[PDB]
Amino acid sequence: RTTRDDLINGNSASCRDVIFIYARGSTETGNLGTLGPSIASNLESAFGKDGVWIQGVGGAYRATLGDNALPRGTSSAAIREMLGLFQQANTKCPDATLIAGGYSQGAALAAASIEDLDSAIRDKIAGTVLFGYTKNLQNRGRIPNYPADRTKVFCNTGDLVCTGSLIVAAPHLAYGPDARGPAPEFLIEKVRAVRGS
Structure with missing residues (x-):
């Protein structure tokens, strides 16, 4: 469940209405890591399996812990990878509504790419x-x-990365309940705000 490539694999003649592009945290597996699968399952319930495409940022984004210390909080090669996925979504499915997310280094990556x-x-x-x-x-x-x-933004009290540090403390590992509820709730509401239902 930690690898989803629905955009890369997807048929351009049968585009989804919603495309979610997600970047995982440092050292996490697949292209969705620990929090992405929980978000994905809730989006699929709301829009249906053919209504949403889930795409993790893989390729050149290796989610290397040391890259947190680089100027933008990730590497240039990772930014190029996530930019290329947004460009693929726009070319393949020009009428799809996009949504995005990231955790930890993946949140810095999402912010840099969107910028x-x-x-x-x-x-x-x-x-x-x-x-x-x-x-x-x-x-x-x-x-x-x-x-x-x-x-x-979901930034826990005592998560030191939210207050300007790069120290990993216990509250940085405690976003599971947000990924199950408030985060997909927000994304669903923002999609429905522009697309209707």
């Missing part, structure tokens, strides 16, 4: 969820160039 993304494409991302956002203090709880109303 650098061409606005035609960025403006199709109806909502973004960030868990354990390592650039939370530096970016003042925002993704640069992206509206606050479409952003939801």
Whole structure:
């Protein structure tokens, strides 16, 4: 359940209405890690298995712990990978609504990619969820160039990465309940806000 490549594998003649692009945390497995599968199962319940495509950021994004210390909180090669997935979604399925998320290094990766993304494409991302956002203090709880109303940050009390450090303490590992409930709830609401139901 930790690898989903629905966008890469998906038929362009049978596009999903909703495409979710997710970046995992440092040292996590597959391309969805620990929190992505819980988000994915809740999105599939809301939109149906053919209504949503789940795509993790794999390829050149190796989720290397040491890359947290680089200027943007991840590597340039990882940013290029996630940018290329947003570009693939826009080309393959131009009428799909996009949603995004990330955890830890993956939250820095999502923020950096969304910042650098061409606005035609960025403006199709109806909502973004960030868990354990390592650039939370530096970016003042925002993704640069992206509206606050479409952003939801989950930053636990005592998660030191949310207050400008790179120390991993116990509250950084405690986002499971958010991934099961509030995070897919937010993403579903932001998709329905623009698409109806």
